[PDB]
C-alpha cells in the first residue's frame, strides 16, 4: 500500500499548493509602491573591544542594554561593560570549542555550549564571590548550535541531531522533544509572547513549532540551499531568514508563504546572521564579504553599508533600547555602532 | 572624575594582565588533527604513542603536542570543518587491507581552507598487507595495475596513486610507513620544518 499512500501524499501536496495559490492575491511591491524610501544611512564606530586572542563565534546582549557577553575558541568567556569598555568577569571553559552563548533575561545566568554535546549554566550571583557551574545539561547526540532562555528555569536548545529540545534547569531532564526535521538544524527564535518558536535546518525548510503542545504546525520551503540565520519580526507575525545561496527571504505565519526576497547580482558569498531593528523597518544582515549590510525590509532595496572588518562577521545583535548594533568577526574585535 | 570607579579600573587591569599572561604561556603547544576513514588504525597509533571530540596531550623534546580525534561524530563535515583551521598539520591514516579513503583524501586535499596546511600520511599494517599480496593479487582493487606480485612494487604503486590526488604545488606531502614507536621522530621533523618555514615567512624574507 506504499504506492497508494505516496499518491495520496502527492495529492495532498497538490491540494495545499492550490490553496496557497488561491489565497495568493497580490504581492508586496504594489502595496509598497507608495512608501517613502528611507534613504541612505551612515554609521560610525563608537567603541571597540580588544580582549580576545582567537576567533569569535557568538555573543548576546543584555536586558538593560549595558552588559555584553562573548565567546571565543581560546576557551574564555568574558562579560563586558559596553559604556566604559571595562571588564566585569572572565570565565574559563572546560572545552575550547564553543559555538553559542546566551544571557538570561533576569541577568542572573549565562549559558554556553559547543562541540562537547553539553550545555552549561553558570551562576553569576554566588555568595562566595566567584562564578561556578550550576549544572551541565547532557541529553543530545550532536553538536549544539543555539541556546535560549525562557525563564530562570527553562532553556530551549537546538542540536545537530535533527532535533530541538526543551529542558528544565532545576532537575536537568528532557521535558519535551521536537522532531520532524531531516538534517542538521542551526537556528532558533523565541516569540515575544514566549509561546512559539521557529527553527531553520540545512534542508532549506523551516518549521513553526508549538511550545505547549509539542507538535509542529507549519512548514515553509522556498529556498535553494542551507539555512544559517532567522529572526522574528518585532510585531510577532512574520520572520526572516538568510541562506547559503546569498539571498534572504521574509516568510509569514498567516498567509503561510513568502512575501518578498532580497537579491543582488554581485552578492555571491553566503549569509551569516540576520536581525531586525526596533521598529522592524531595517533588516541587518551579516555576510562573508568581510562586511555587514542594511536592507530596507519593505522596499527590498539597498539602504547602506557597514564596513570596517578585516574578516567575515560571525555574529550580530541590536540593543533592546534600539540604540546600538554590535558585530564580531574572527579578528577578535567587536565594534559597537550607533 | 571618578568616585569608586577606580576600583573597577583596577579590577579590569588585573583581569587583563592575567588574560595576557595565560595567552602568552599557552602558545608553546602545537595542535594536530587526525583524519581518515573508519577503523583506519588512528586509535592504534594514538595509543602506541602513550563523546564528541577526544584530545590527547604528550610532550617530546621540550615540546608538548596536542592530538584531536574527530571521527566519533556523524554530521555534516563541511558544517564544522572550519573550526580546525590554522592547525599545524593533518595526520592522515590509511589501512592497506580494503576507494573510500582515496575519495576522502581527494576531498580534503583540495579544500579551500586547507590549501596550504601540510599533510602527513601513515600507511599502516605492512606485514599483513605484504602477506596478502604474496598470497593474493591486488587486481580486485586496482584492475588497471600491472607488475610482479612482490612487496615493494605494490607499495610504490599505492603510494603513487595516493600522491597523484593533489593539485596545488604549494602543499607538501610527507609519506612514511609504520607497523617501533618511531612516529614521534617523523612528526617532530615535519613540525620543525613547518615552524622554520613559518618563521622565515613571518620575517618577510620568505
Amino acid at each position: 500500500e506504499l504506492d497508494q499512500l505516496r499518491q495520496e501524499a502527492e495529492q495532498l501536496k497538490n491540494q495545499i499548493r492550490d490553496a496557497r495559490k488561491a489565497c495568493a492575491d497580490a504581492t508586496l511591491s504594489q502595496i509598497t509602491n507608495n512608501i517613502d524610501p528611507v534613504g541612505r544611512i551612515q554609521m560610525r564606530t563608537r567603541r571597540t573591544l580588544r580582549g580576545h586572542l582567537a576567533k569569535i563565534y557568538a555573543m548576546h546582549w543584555g536586558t538593560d542594554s549595558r552588559l555584553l557577553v562573548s565567546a571565543s575558541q581560546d576557551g574564555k568567556l568574558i562579560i563586558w561593560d559596553s559604556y566604559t569598555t571595562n571588564k566585569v568577569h572572565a570565565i574559563p571553559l572546560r572545552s575550547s570549542w564553543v559555538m553559542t552563548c546566551a544571557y538570561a533575561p533576569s541577568g542572573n545566568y549565562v549559558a554556553c555550549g559547543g562541540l562537547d554535546n553539553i550545555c552549561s549554566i553558570y551562576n553569576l550571583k554566588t555568595r562566595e564571590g566567584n562564578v561556578r557551574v550550576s549544572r551541565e545539561l547532557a541529553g543530545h547526540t550532536g553538536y549544539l548550535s543555539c541556546c535560549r532562555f525562557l525563564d530562570d528555569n527553562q532553556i530551549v536548545t537546538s542540536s545537530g541531531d535533527t532535533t530541538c529540545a526543551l529542558w528544565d534547569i532545576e532537575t536537568g531532564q528532557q521535558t519535551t522533544t521536537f522532531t520532524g526535521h531531516t538534517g542538521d538544524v542551526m537556528s532558533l527564535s523565541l516569540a515575544p509572547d514566549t509561546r512559539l518558536f521557529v527553527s531553520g535546518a540545512c534542508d532549506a525548510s523551516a518549521k513553526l513549532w508549538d511550545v505547549r503542545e509539542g507538535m509542529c504546525r507549519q512548514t515553509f520551503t522556498g529556498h535553494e540551499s542551507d539555512i544559517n540565520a532567522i529572526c522574528f519580526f518585532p510585531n510577532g507575525n512574520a520572520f526572516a531568514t538568510g541562506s547559503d545561496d546569498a539571498t534572504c527571504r521574509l516568510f509569514d505565519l498567516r498567509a503561510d508563504q513568502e512575501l518578498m526576497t532580497y537579491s543582488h547580482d554581485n552578492i555571491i558569498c553566503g549569509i551569516t546572521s540576520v536581525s531586525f531593528s526596533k521598529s522592524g523597518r531595517l533588516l541587518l544582515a551579516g555576510y562573508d564579504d568581510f562586511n555587514c549590510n542594511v536592507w530596507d525590509a519593505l522596499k527590498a532595496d539597498r539602504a547602506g553599508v557597514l564596513a570596517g572588518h578585516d574578516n567575515r562577521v560571525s555574529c550580530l545583535g541590536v540593543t533592546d533600547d534600539g540604540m546600538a548594533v554590535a558585530t564580531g568577526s574572527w579578528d577578535s574585535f567587536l565594534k559597537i555602532w550607533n | 572624575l571618578s568616585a569608586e570607579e577606580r576600583a573597577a579600573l583596577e579590577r579590569s587591569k588585573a583581569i587583563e594582565k592575567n588574560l595576557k599572561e595565560d595567552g602568552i604561556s599557552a602558545a608553546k603547544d602545537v595542535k594536530l588533527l587526525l583524519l581518515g576513514a573508519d577503523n583506519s588504525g588512528k586509535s592504534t597509533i594514538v595509543k602506541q604513542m602513550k563523546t564528541g571530540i577526544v584530545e590527547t596531550h604528550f610532550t617530546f623534546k621540550n615540546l608538548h603536542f596536542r592530538l584531536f580525534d574527530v571521527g566519533g561524530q556523524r554530521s555534516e563535515r563541511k558544517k564544522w570543518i572550519h573550526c580546525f583551521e590554522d592547525v599545524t598539520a593533518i595526520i592522515f591514516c590509511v589501512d592497506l587491507s580494503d576507494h573510500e579513503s582515496l575519495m576522502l583524501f581527494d576531498s580534503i586535499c583540495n579544500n579551500k581552507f586547507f590549501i596550504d596546511t601540510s599533510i602527513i600520511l601513515f600507511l599502516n599494517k605492512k606485514d599483513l598487507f605484504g602477506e596478502k599480496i604474496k598470497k593474493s593479487p591486488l587486481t580486485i582493487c586496482f584492475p588497471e595495475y600491472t607488475g610482479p606480485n612482490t612487496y615493494e612494487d605494490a607499495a610504490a604503486y599505492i603510494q603513487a596513486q595516493f600522491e597523484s590526488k593533489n593539485r596545488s604545488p604549494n602543499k607538501e606531502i610527507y609519506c612514511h610507513m609504520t607497523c617501533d614507536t618511531n612516529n614521534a621522530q617523523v612528526i617532530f621533523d615535519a613540525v620543525t620544518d613547518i615552524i622554520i618555514a613559518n618563521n622565515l615567512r613571518g620575517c618577510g624574507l620568505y
Epitope: 571595562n86 562566595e128 564571590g129 | 568616585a3 569608586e4 573597577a8 583596577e10
Partner: single-chain antibody
C-alpha cells in the same frame, strides 16, 4: 558560611605596641577588599584604614596617619594591623569588613564579630537630628540623615548606605546606594531622597527592629558616619 574573626586586642599600657589579625575563611579572599572600623565604648562607629585587592592601594585617616600599619597575606587570607605608639584616647572596638567593587556590586555586605582594645592612663560631615524616639508596634515611622554636600556624582547615581545595629552584636547592611535592598532583608524597608535630604521609611514594625541606625557615605575618602538614632518600644 562566611567567617571573619578578629583577635589581638587587650590591655595595653601607654607607649606600648600591639598587633591585630582578623582571619578570613569561607570565601575567595583574593578578590575582596578589607577595612578596619572603630567604635568608641560609648559613641558611634568610626573609620580607620583601607587596603585594596592585591595590596595595590592603601588609604588612611588623618588622626592615624603615620602611626598605624596595615598588611595582608593572601596565602593565609589574613589582615594585619600594627598599633604603634598608642595614645590615651584610642580604646575602642575593631572589626573587618568585605568591600568588593565592580559594576552593580554590594560592598560592606559582611561584618566581623569584633575585639576590644583597652588602654591605661572640606570633609563631608553627616549628622542625625534626633537621638531616641518611641515607636509603637505596627506603625510606620521615618528617619532623617542630612549631609553637608550634594552626593550626586556625574555618572547619575548617588552613594548613601544605611546601616542598622541591633543591641548586642555587629551591624548589618540594609540599603546600598539609597535605593537597593540587600539580600536577606524584608521588603518593608524603603529609601528616598535627592541631593542632600535623605530619609528611610519603614512600616509594619516588629520586635526585631529595635536598635540604632547609622548612615554612612562613600563618595570620597575619608568616609564619615553618623551619630546614631535609637528606637525603643512604646
Amino acid at each position: 558560611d562566611v567567617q571573619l574573626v578578629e583577635s589581638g586586642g587587650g590591655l595595653v599600657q601607654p607607649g606600648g605596641s600591639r598587633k591585630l589579625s582578623c582571619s578570613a575563611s569561607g570565601f575567595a579572599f583574593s578578590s575582596f577588599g578589607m577595612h578596619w572600623v572603630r567604635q568608641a565604648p560609648e559613641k558611634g562607629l568610626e573609620w580607620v584604614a583601607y587596603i585594596s585587592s592585591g595590596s595595590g592601594t592603601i588609604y588612611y585617616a588623618d588622626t592615624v596617619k603615620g602611626r598605624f600599619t596595615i598588611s595582608r597575606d593572601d596565602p593565609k587570607n589574613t589582615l594585619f594591623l600594627q598599633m604603634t605608639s598608642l595614645r590615651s584616647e584610642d580604646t575602642a572596638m575593631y572589626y573587618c569588613v568585605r568591600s568588593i567593587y565592580y559594576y552593580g556590586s554590594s560592598p560592606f555586605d559582611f561584618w566581623g564579630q569584633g575585639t576590644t582594645l583597652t588602654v591605661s592612663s572640606s570633609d563631608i560631615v553627616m549628622t542625625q537630628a534626633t537621638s531616641s524616639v518611641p515607636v509603637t508596634p505596627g506603625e510606620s515611622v521615618s528617619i532623617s540623615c542630612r549631609s553637608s554636600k550634594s552626593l550626586l556624582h556625574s555618572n547619575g547615581n548617588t552613594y548613601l548606605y544605611w546601616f542598622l545595629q541591633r543591641p548586642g552584636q555587629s551591624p548589618q547592611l540594609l540599603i546600598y546606594r539609597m535605593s537597593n535592598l540587600a539580600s536577606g532583608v524584608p521588603d518593608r524597608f524603603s529609601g528616598s531622597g535627592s541631593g542632600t535630604a535623605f530619609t528611610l521609611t519603614i512600616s509594619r514594625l516588629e520586635a526585631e527592629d529595635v536598635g540604632v541606625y547609622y548612615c554612612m557615605q562613600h563618595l570620597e575618602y575619608p568616609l564619615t558616619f553618623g551619630a546614631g538614632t535609637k528606637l525603643e518600644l512604646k
